[PDB]
């Protein structure tokens, strides 16, 4: 029996280290739990080392089909706080009972209903792995110090207006060099960009829109096609 992290280490070396976030566009014809589960299974068959799944209905359906680790989250829109990713202790509890192997939480220093330390503690005390979705060197190192197993770059570009087009590669290297196990996540919209994250020190790379958001991909094509007519 080898630890989940040790298994992922070996599968990343063998396969590449792709994690597919299977989150279709809200309202999409493709946003159905059976379709999310099928996307996750397809990703597993294609060599993904893990999948990210949002929501309990999607998680329950996916759990049945996949054998790779599931990173679970629940997204919420809070009345005042800008935090969205797994903000509540009850959300941690629900993901743990529904079969997530890793639970990710927003790791930012922002107004929020539950302290980051408390969310991480709740996950660990379900005997699951923790992932802190971080935005900066400072928040990432704080979450490292709180004992998060994995630091994601998921929130970089999303705490302040004007999200950059390019992914935040330097953050991957800063966190890696500081001793973090880093998942690069956010705007890795081509295989070429994902490879650059590896070059910057990523342990694995999570890709969402470019694989599982058909409408979003169509938009990128329309943008380019329209400019070429202009
Ligand atoms: C297609 C895709 O993966 N887009 C991600 C979204 O999944 C994530 O929720 C958000 C986090 O920022 P937020 O918590 O401020 O919305 O970053 C990006 O928008
Ligand atoms: Cl996400």
CA distance 202 to 199: 7
**Length of the chain as a residue count:** 230
How was it solved? X-ray
Domain that holds residue 132: 1-230
Query: For the chain, what is the domain count?
Result: 1
Q: How many CB atoms lie within 10 A of CB 138?
A: 11
CA distance 43 to 52: 11
Q: Other CB atoms closer than 10 Å to residue 6's CB: what's the count?
A: 10
The pairing of strands 204-207 and 70-73 is unpaired
Nearest bound ligand to the CA of residue 208 = 1
**Which of 21, 87, 29 is closest to 49 using CA atoms?**
21
Cα of 230 to ligand 2 centre, how many Å? 34
Q: Is the torsion defined by CA of 107, 169, 164, 17 positive or negative?
A: negative
* Ligand 1 in reach of 213 Cβ (< 6 A): yes
H helices present in 16-88, as ranges: 33-45, 56-63
Cα(76) to centroid of ligand 1, in Å? Answer: 12
The phi, psi pair for 29, rounded to 5°, reads -55, -25
CATH for 111: 3.20.20.70
> Could you tell me if 105 and 86 are in contact, meaning their C-beta atoms sit under 8 angstroms apart?
yes
Look-up: residue for tokens 């910057």?
200
* Residue 40 three-state SS: helix
Spatial CA neighbour of 148 closest among 132, 171, 136: 132
For a ligand 1 pocket test, name from 209, 216, 220 the mutation site with the most ligand atoms within 8 angstroms of its C-beta: 209
Bridge partner list, 230 = none
- Residue owning tokens 């970089």: 156
């Amino acid at each position: 029996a080898m630890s989940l992290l040790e298994q992922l280490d070996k599968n990343i070396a063998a396969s590449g280290g792709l994690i597919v976030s299977c989150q279709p566009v809200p309202g999409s014809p493709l946003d159905k739990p059976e379709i999310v589960a099928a996307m996750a299974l397809a990703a597993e068959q294609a060599g993904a080392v893990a999948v990210r799944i949002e929501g309990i209905d999607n998680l329950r359906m996916t759990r049945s089909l996949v054998s790779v680790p599931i990173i679970g989250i629940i997204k919420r829109d809070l009345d005042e706080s800008p935090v969205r990713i797994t903000p509540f202790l009850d959300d941690v509890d629900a993901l743990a009972q529904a079969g997530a192997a890793i639970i990710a939480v927003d790791g930012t220093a922002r107004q929020r209903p539950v302290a980051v330390e408390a969310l991480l503690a709740r996950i660990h005390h379900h005997h699951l792995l923790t992932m802190a979705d971080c935005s900066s060197v400072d928040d990432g190192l704080a979450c490292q110090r709180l004992g998060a197993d994995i630091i994601g770059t998921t929130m970089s570009g999303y705490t302040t207006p004007d999200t950059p087009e390019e992914p935040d590669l330097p953050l991957v290297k800063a966190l890696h060099d500081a001793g973090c196990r880093v998942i690069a996540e956010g705007r890795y919209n081509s295989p070429a960009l994902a490879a650059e994250a590896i070059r910057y020190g990523a342990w694995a790379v999570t890709v969402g829109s470019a694989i599982t958001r058909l409408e979003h991909i169509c938009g990128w094509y329309n943008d380019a096609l329209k400019k070429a007519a202009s």
